[PDB]
Design a binder for these strands. Structure first.
Ligand SMILES: [Mg+2]
Ligand SMILES: [Zn+2]
Lengths: 350, 225, 453, 124, 94
RNA sequence: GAAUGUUACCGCAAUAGUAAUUGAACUUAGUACGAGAGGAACAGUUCAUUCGGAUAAUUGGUUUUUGCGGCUGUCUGAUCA
RNA sequence: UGUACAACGGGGUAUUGUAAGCAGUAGAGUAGCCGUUACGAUCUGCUGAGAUUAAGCCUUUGUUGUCUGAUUUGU
């Protein structure tokens, strides 16, 4: 009979870092343009979407169905550097790293720990080398062109722009899908300090996989028949695959929550706000199902590492309405207008 | 006109469809084999509306109607009602009858001139059905069967009833309906003749289980030829 | 059971069956036992192995016995057919021998199990088990010939025909090479060799055809030679038994031509001597190969023999041929009519003063053209579109946008169905201004009524 | 959410009339260590007639559940349930013995059993 | 949509929220949340509950072309009803 | 917790473990095979039991909000809080 | 020494159910005279009010207070 879990997931010691490191990246298709392999963000909360589907041969074909969906915060991102790797018998080794020298205070805080007590002796000294006519970054580009057949770009999250006010941002590597590494490095150099749009990397109905750290539960350490004669739960990296993206959330403008059917002008911000989270005011991605971890936990979005031709991925969504009632209790209305209509005027109104 | 036809693997043709003299309903599920099978005999004379009722594939029994109109249960969703209104002919009317009973096809059976209703159906629903269909309404039961539509089948031509009906009951039903009546059987003696198949004044459809004598009896009573 | 008992498990020969049983016993039981093990455990293991082997043998024998058709009392016709095919006495004796062998195996297993529980030394238990296995093998060894014969008859019994004499049937019979096999092939949708020799259809092939909305089965048989009822072959004995037991008249064929080189006097004498088989069948006679003889142009002496055939009550002489099968329709019609007569002899609207109606078949259906599926020039039958689209697996049904409305733009317009308030369907009606024209007056008369100042 | 567990004394739902039935067995049950079968709405199960017609007593027949009475999450987000557990009796092919039904029937059971749907008037 | 209003409280019941319950009476019971469901299950008439809408109404508390044309109706009716409710509340204070 | 002169970030992997499992509704099918009885799977979709990774919007129990309003009796002299 | 931080109250959103008291003295009845007078359950307006105001939900260019205190490491 089965056992108390999967032996491949044991031992289950605590994760070495809150941020889930990417184990692998999708194969580099040279014929495709210079796109982005993955993205990083913080998940806000859960919501319910009611929609119909075009699924011929299914019992619920042409019938409206409600499925669990989640909203992940993903504000605009700016590239901070580029990293190249060379294949070796010991594996892929980092050749050299480059920086634009135009690093925001967020990455400086991330690098340091006691920023308030820190003297703020940032990269300025090294930047002074770059703050010239050049020929240094040109040398780095030449080195990464002659070698480093695989290039990974470095980006940092706009933690300051996140609804949950914070000063320290996360940093992680992201690969490219473009042609020969010449185009990759040229695009990376041109895109230094340039804003990155989430919608440019994903699209509706796209199948994606994500990695995150599950909720911790503290110490979790009876039958006296275990050994023959002849202690932690949660707070570990976990992966999930085959997640359908229903719609790209352009949360910097109204009408994102309402669909073409309901057109109930409002934002996806649940009444009162997300539990233990702020108020979304920037770009976000809508993905069905659920992702490990809790609110404010960093998550990574990847396109499954491979292309899928199954009809499930091909099928397109027909969102009719998105639920945004107050999750802080037994919510009954989507916007204050509905609550006022139901209850009418109140003492506070006069 | 009488051509053998089958569902995916079910002989209950009338459960998933309800043929009428001016329109036909078919479940959206399955495949177009049923749709094409009905089109072959029906050609393109009238629209064949692929539609669901309350999300179920039993639309044939849930709904009932005649040439002058179609009736649907209150359980039908707004989208389904809108689709039916925009797909059915202008002459056919639809309404959200607010009555306790749901299965119009099983609880009610009617033709272009005569309609049988449950003895306990509300007066308002009876009047609405009479106005919509342009037919007379009579309170009757087939040998004590509460589900008149589940056993009785009636068109402008002769009608068919399940074999358990007594001779006196058959004669009384024929006299009231003013149509020829024979206590035939379908689908190898199945008693669901009123709901397991569909038929009208020109077209008769039934499961493959219908033996050749049953097909001959159906043709003779309905006089398709 | 009845109707093609082929489901018998086609037992392997005695040697193969014994090898299979021994392999199963070895594989499904433990093998590694040592002297140091407790005597009780070793004895229990040996007893378990012996019991498993005995139970396997008993189950095999019981399944073999049960699978057989139970010839006794099954049916007189089937019983006689089986007796002719497999010499009933031998088959019964073989089954009795198998039952006796099973009983002996049971007794031996019980005796060895009883004795095995007393041996002290491991060697004693091993020797007792070996003796039990040898006894079982010796019992099985003598069963080789009955098992092989039963396997052969099963190989033959499985493919035997399956018909119920109690049902309505009409058969074809006559001299061999009269064209009877061709008549059987033509009359019913059955494939049988039509080679021109006197034993074409050695086996009693069964044909099925439908008439008057009822299924009518038929059988075939080469017939009977002179056969004075003392010297008959198995094939002819089967035909005689079938004719005796079977239901309503079997068609008697006669080749009135040069072929079938027996004088027509012999053909007449055959049916005259077989007359006792005509107790209540109301036999019918059909002349075959009429095309190349035209019995009308027959000698008076020969015609007298044909006339004598008509003398016996309840007979008819119908013309039939193989090159042209037009007569087969009339032959089958007459046979079915006689069969129905034999099977039978064994035993409103009310014009309620008010209803007026006409057949309401729509003019469209009345004037629309008949559909033809095989003709390439036909309607789309969007099932074909689905088939070319990849079937229902990927065919996205799109009957939407193809419904009757006022304008062609409404086909693609997405109905909102929601406007931040309860659905408009509750109040969705044409000319909405009826609920807006008076709203201005209502607002004016509510504002100027002193209720706000 | 599965319905009643094994042995539940469910009430009859046919027109013939029976006091109750005992679910001795289930078909397509999720056989698992420590997980007993639980017949859900619309599932055909073999339930003995604990009490009812004298001839029907002391024999097992395939019982088709028409009511669940428990909270189950349909694909529709509404967590609907029913007054009490009830189920009709029919042969393995769904041929209901009775000529009518008692009480309402759900869409989930009606869809899987066309005969039951034809045998019921108050659907949903 | 066909969103149903709770027959007890008259409040809207959005899809996925509340519970819809039916009995052998073939009547659909709709509740926006557990409180009203249990209140109805206890035979408590809504007129006995102050918060429910029915008591407020009884006691005098608060008394393509087609879609394009009806767009205006919803806002106008909502504003008129809100104004009427506010006026009623003004005289409610005494 | 000594690693590696100090600190923090990014990563590669030498190495240890490894998982999914089984069934069914259709399509092809009442076609090949079938005198009849009966009757497929090769492709694609769609569902289902157990188990593995996660939760937390919907649903049941578990309630230390002492949170709301109230009920039985006692107390600051019944009632104030 | 800056959207700096924590608290304050509000707003938004939810839990529950109409708060202490006042008055229309409206008022089932208790006690005096022999229908009436005093007390007054209860309803009604302040008041879908009050409280919780997640102790573990979001905001606060508005108010208050602080932006200081120790220690270790060298190619
Ligand atoms: Mg021959
Ligand atoms: Zn409610």
């Amino acid at each position: 009979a089965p056992r108390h879990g999967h032996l491949g997931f044991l031992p289950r010691k605590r994760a070495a870092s809150i941020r889930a490191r990417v184990k692998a990246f999708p194969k580099d298709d040279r014929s495709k343009p210079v796109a982005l392999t993955s993205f990083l963000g913080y998940k806000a909360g859960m919501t319910t979407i009611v929609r119909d589907l075009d699924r011929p041969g299914s019992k619920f074909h042409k019938r409206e169905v409600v499925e669990a969906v989640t909203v992940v915060d993903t504000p605009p991102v700016v590239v901070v550097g580029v990293v190249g790797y060379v294949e070796t018998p010991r594996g892929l080794r980092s050749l050299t790293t480059v920086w634009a020298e135009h690093l925001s205070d967020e990455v400086k805080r991330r690098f340091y720990k006691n920023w308030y007590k820190s003297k703020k002796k940032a990269f300025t000294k090294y930047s002074a080398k770059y703050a010239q006519d050049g020929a240094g970054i040109e040398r780095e580009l030449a080195r990464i062109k002659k070698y480093a057949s695989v290039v990974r770009v470095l980006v940092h999250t706009q933690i300051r722009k996140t609804p949950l006010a914070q000063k320290k941002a996360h940093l992680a590597e992201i690969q490219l899908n473009g042609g020969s590494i010449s185009e990759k490095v040229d695009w990376a150099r041109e895109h230094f300090e340039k804003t990155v749009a989430v919608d440019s990397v994903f699209e509706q109905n796209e199948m994606i996989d994500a990695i995150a750290v599950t909720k911790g539960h503290g110490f979790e350490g009876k039958v006296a028949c275990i050994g023959a004669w002849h202690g932690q739960r949660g707070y570990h990296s976990r992966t999930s695959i085959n997640h359908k993206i229903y719609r790209v959330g352009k949360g910097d403008d109204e009408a994102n929550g309402a669909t073409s059917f309901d057109r109930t002008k409002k934002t996806i911000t649940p009444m009162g706000g997300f539990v233990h989270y702020g108020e979304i005011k920037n770009d976000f991605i809508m993905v069905k199902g659920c992702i490990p971890g809790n609110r404010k936990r960093i998550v990574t979005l990847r396109k499954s590492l491979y292309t899928n031709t199954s009809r499930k991925a091909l099928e397109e969504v027909s969102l009719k309405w998105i639920d945004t009632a107050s999750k802080f209790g037994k919510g009954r209305f989507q916007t204050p207008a509905e609550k006022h209509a139901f209850m009418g005027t109140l003492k506070k109104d006069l | 006109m009488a051509t053998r036809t089958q569902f995916e693997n079910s002989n209950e043709i009338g459960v998933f469809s309800k043929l009428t003299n001016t329109y036909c309903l078919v479940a959206v599920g399955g495949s177009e084999n049923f749709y094409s099978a009905f089109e072959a005999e029906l050609g393109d004379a009238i629209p064949i509306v692929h539609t669901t009722i309350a999300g179920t594939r039993i639309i044939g029994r849930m709904t009932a109607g005649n040439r002058r109109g179609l009736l649907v249960p209150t359980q039908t969703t707004d989208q389904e009602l809108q689709h039916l209104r925009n797909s059915l002919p202008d002459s056919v009317k639809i309404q959200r009858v607010e009555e306790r009973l749901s299965a119009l096809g099983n609880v009610i059976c009617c033709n272009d001139y005569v309609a049988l209703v449950h003895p306990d159906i509300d007066r308002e629903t009876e009047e609405l059905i009479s106005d919509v269909l342009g037919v007379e309404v009579f309170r009757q039961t087939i040998s004590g069967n509460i589900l008149v539509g589940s056993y009785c089948s009636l068109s402008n031509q002769g009608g068919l009833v399940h074999p358990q009906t007594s001779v006196q009951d058959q004669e009384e039903l024929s006299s009231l309906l003013q149509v020829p009546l024979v206590a035939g059987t379908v689908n190898r003696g199945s008693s669901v003749v009123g709901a397991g198949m569909v038929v009208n004044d020109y077209l008769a459809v039934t499961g493959l289980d219908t033996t050749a004598p049953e097909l001959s009896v159906i043709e003779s009573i309905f006089r398709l030829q | 059971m009845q109707l093609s008992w082929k489901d018998i498990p086609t037992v392997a020969p005695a040697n193969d069956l014994l090898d299979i049983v021994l392999n199963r016993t070895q594989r499904k039981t433990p093998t590694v036992i040592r002297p140091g093990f407790k005597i009780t455990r070793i004895r229990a293991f040996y007893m378990r192995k012996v019991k498993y082997t005995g139970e396997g043998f008993v189950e095999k024998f019981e399944d073999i016995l049960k699978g057989f058709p139970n010839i006794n009392d099954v049916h007189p016709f089937h019983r006689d057919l089986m007796d002719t095919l497999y010499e009933k006495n031998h088959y019964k004796i073989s089954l009795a021998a198998i039952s006796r062998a099973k009983s002996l195996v049971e007794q031996v297993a019980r005796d060895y199990v009883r004795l095995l529980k007393f041996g002290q030394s491991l060697f004693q238990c091993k020797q007792l088990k070996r003796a039990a296995l040898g006894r079982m093998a010796t019992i099985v060894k003598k069963l080789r010939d009955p098992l092989a014969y039963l396997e052969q008859v099963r190989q033959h019994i499985g493919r035997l025909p399956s018909i119920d004499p109690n049902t309505r049937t009409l058969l074809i019979c006559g001299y061999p090479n009269v064209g009877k096999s061709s008549f059987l092939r033509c009359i019913t949708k059955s494939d049988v060799d039509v080679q021109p020799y006197a034993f074409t259809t050695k086996s009693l092939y069964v044909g099925h055809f439908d008439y008057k909305y009822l299924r009518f089965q038929a059988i075939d048989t080469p017939g009977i030679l002179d056969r004075p009822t003392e010297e008959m072959n198995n094939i002819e004995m089967q035909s005689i038994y079938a004719i005796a037991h079977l239901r309503s008249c079997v068609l008697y064929f006669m080749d009135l031509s040069e072929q079938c080189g027996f004088t027509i006097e012999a053909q007449v004498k055959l049916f005259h001597s077989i007359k006792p088989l005509f107790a209540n069948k109301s036999v019918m006679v059909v002349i075959n190969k009429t095309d190349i003889i035209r019995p009308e142009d027959l000698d008076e002496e020969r015609a007298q023999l044909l006339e004598s055939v008509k003398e016996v009550p309840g007979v008819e002489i119908m013309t039939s041929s193989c090159q042209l099968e037009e007569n087969v329709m009339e032959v089958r019609n007459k046979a079915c009519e006689k069969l129905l007569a034999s099977r039978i002899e064994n035993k409103q609207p009310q014009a309620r003063d008010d209803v007026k109606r006409t057949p309401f078949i729509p003019e469209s259906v009345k004037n629309l053209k008949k559909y033809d599926p095989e003709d390439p020039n036909r309607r789309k039958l969007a099932r074909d579109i689905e088939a070319e689209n990849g079937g229902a697996g990927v065919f996205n049904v799109n009957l939407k946008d193809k419904y009757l409305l006022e304008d062609d733009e409404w086909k693609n317009d997405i109905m909102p169905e929601i406007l931040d308030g309860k659905n408009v369907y509750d109040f969705l009606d044409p000319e909405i201004a009826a609920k807006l024209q008076a709203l201005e007056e209502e607002e004016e008369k509510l504002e100027n009524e002193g209720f706000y100042n | 959410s599965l319905g009643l567990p094994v042995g539940a004394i469910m009430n009859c739902a046919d027109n013939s009339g029976a006091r109750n039935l005992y679910i001795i067995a289930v078909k397509g049950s999720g056989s698992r260590l420590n997980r007993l079968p639980a017949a859900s709405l619309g599932d055909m199960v073999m339930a003995t007639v604990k009490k009812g017609k004298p001839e029907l007593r002391k024999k097992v027949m395939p019982a088709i559940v028409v009511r669940q009475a428990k909270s189950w999450r349909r694909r529709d987000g509404v967590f609907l349930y029913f007054e009490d557990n009830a189920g009709v009796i029919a042969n393995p092919k769904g041929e209901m013995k009775g000529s009518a039904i008692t009480g309402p029937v759900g869409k989930e059971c009606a869809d899987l059993w066309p005969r039951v749907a034809s045998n019921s008037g108050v659907v949903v | 949509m066909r969103i149903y209003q709770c027959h007890f409280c008259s409040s809207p019941c959005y899809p996925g929220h509340g519970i819809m319950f039916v009995r052998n009476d073939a009547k659909e019971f709709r509740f926006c949340r557990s409180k009203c469901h249990k209140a109805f299950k206890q035979r408590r008439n809504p007129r006995k509950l102050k918060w429910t809408k029915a008591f407020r109404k009884a006691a005098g508390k608060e008394l393509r072309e087609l879609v394009a044309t009806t767009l205006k109706a919803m806002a106008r009716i909502e504003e008129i009803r809100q104004k009427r409710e506010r006026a009623f509340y003004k005289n409610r204070m005494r």
